[PDB]
């Protein structure tokens, strides 16, 4: 039989948590953007390797290849952005870009105390791309060019 | 194929980990693979064939391993660097052995045999202490 211990937070544990506290669970989310078969087991890995081998000649194996590649692309799709910005992780980082209130005026005492990440997310969906681009140019503009020039003697 | 250190103890091996530096492969191998990637056009025209299929799968696997290993270093706030530190007190519950014995007369691989049931937690405490907390503390300083 199997007995059980205790959290140790848990996957998506902060999903409904107030963002102020949920902000301290980032390790859990990040840990699992490449998984669902964690720990040796150690029969699960053996089985998966066995099916990855046996099924290499057929469509179902191909569909596993499809899924695996997808996972990797999604991962790197985020790592790319984190690399481009001066935010190599690090779970969090700050920019030089000033928050433009056009996006949202809401008070921080409302944000950090009574709102989930998803509620917050709904409100900034349409400004995501703009925000990214502004971070990007802020990263390059001066913070890298002038930086180079700050070592210019 | 950087396993030269396997014939030594952890002390000594620890002097050669930085000597290894140059990746275990990949890198220049990927540059050689670039030459092969050009060839892949021929191997495209080839059509679907066993070995070809295996190769595709082999590439996928290789890459998956690379990134999985790298991932944790990023999340840990250690990046790399081959040697980093983290503020996690070595809970003696895991092990209790003199450092002289841990580093000397201790094949690295052999050492792993006795750490395996604790490695999982150790990763957790690293995460949830080292980066979970410290990340905020820097921001918290920057708030003032």
């Amino acid at each position, epitope marked *: 039989a199997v007995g059980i*211990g205790a959290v140790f937070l848990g996957f998506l544990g902060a999903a409904g948590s107030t963002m102020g506290a949920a902000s301290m669970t980032l390790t859990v989310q990040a840990r699992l953007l490449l998984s*669902g078969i*964690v*720990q040796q087991q150690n029969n699960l890995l053996r089985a998966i390797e066995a099916q990855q081998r046996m099924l290499q000649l057929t469509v179902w194996g191909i569909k596993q290849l499809q899924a695996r590649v997808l996972a990797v692309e999604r991962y790197l799709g985020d790592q790319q952005l984190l690399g481009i910005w001066g935010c190599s992780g690090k779970l969090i980082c700050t920019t030089a870009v000033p928050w433009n209130a056009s996006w949202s005026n809401k008070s921080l005492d409302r944000i950090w105390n009574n709102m989930t990440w998803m509620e917050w997310e709904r409100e900034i969906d349409n400004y995501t791309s703009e925000i990214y681009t502004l971070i990007e140019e802020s990263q390059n503009q001066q913070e890298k060019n002038e930086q180079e020039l700050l070592e210019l003697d | 194929g950087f396993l030269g250190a396997a014939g030594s103890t952890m002390g000594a091996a620890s002097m050669t980990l930085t000597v290894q530096a140059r990746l275990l492969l990949s890198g220049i191998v990927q540059q050689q693979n670039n030459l092969l990637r050009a060839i892949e056009a021929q191997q495209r025209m080839l059509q679907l064939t066993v070995w070809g299929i295996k190769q595709l799968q082999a590439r996928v696997l290789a890459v998956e391993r690379y990134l999985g290993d790298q991932q944790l270093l990023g999340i840990w706030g250690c990046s790399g660097k081959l040697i980093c530190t983290t503020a996690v007190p070595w809970n003696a519950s895991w092990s209790n052995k003199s450092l002289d014995r841990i580093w000397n007369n201790m094949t690295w691989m052999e050492w792993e045999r006795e750490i395996d*049931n*604790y490695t999982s937690e150790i990763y957790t405490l690293i995460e949830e202490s080292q980066n979970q907390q410290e990340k905020n503390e820097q921001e918290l300083l920057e708030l003032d």
Partner: antibody
Amino acid sequence: VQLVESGGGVVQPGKSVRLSCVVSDFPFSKYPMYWVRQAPGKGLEWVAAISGDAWHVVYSNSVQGRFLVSRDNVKNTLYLEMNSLKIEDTAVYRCARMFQESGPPRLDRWSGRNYYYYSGMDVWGQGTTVTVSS
Amino acid sequence: IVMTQTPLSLSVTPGQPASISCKSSESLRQSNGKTSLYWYRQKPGQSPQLLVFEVSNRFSGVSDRFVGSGSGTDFTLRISRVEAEDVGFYYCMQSKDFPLTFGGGTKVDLKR
């Protein structure tokens, strides 16, 4: 290995006892332990189980809330306290050691919550009897 | 999750083959890729003696005359050349999940 029980006898319903077990010849803190129960002229009944690190513990429904089992990993002993005994608790009680020793609770990193592994048994003590009624 | 045994009692002569059947109402496969079912015996005044564990893996200090096997929901023992010493009560125990449970209990004895 040495596995003996101590502190049996007879009591009235509503009374309580502290039935202990003393062991030797092994790394006690690495072996989860069992308490088993056999009523006179009847078959076996599992009662309770306690993990090697003495953190995890489970009971049978019929005893849950009345029995309390503890450990002393320094002195190599078990302590099965039984409160508010009922007449039907009259039985042979016995201390036993798990066959396959478990390591530390395997933690899975996907909300694993530290799992403990439990297996069979390989050493039964002699046993003693606790009799209940006025 | 219960478990039953047959025969209730079994009378066999020294050198005679014999068997013990224990059926589970529930699947016995464990998450480690093996089943969780053990057998053992005790004589009057004696305590259970692990006979075999994990079905086919008989215990150290136990004769090869003791064998057994079965499906993912039930298992049986077979004892070849039953010895005069092989009398007493036999049980099976499911450890697949809590609470731990036992088979009905069988009594092996001699016939004359």
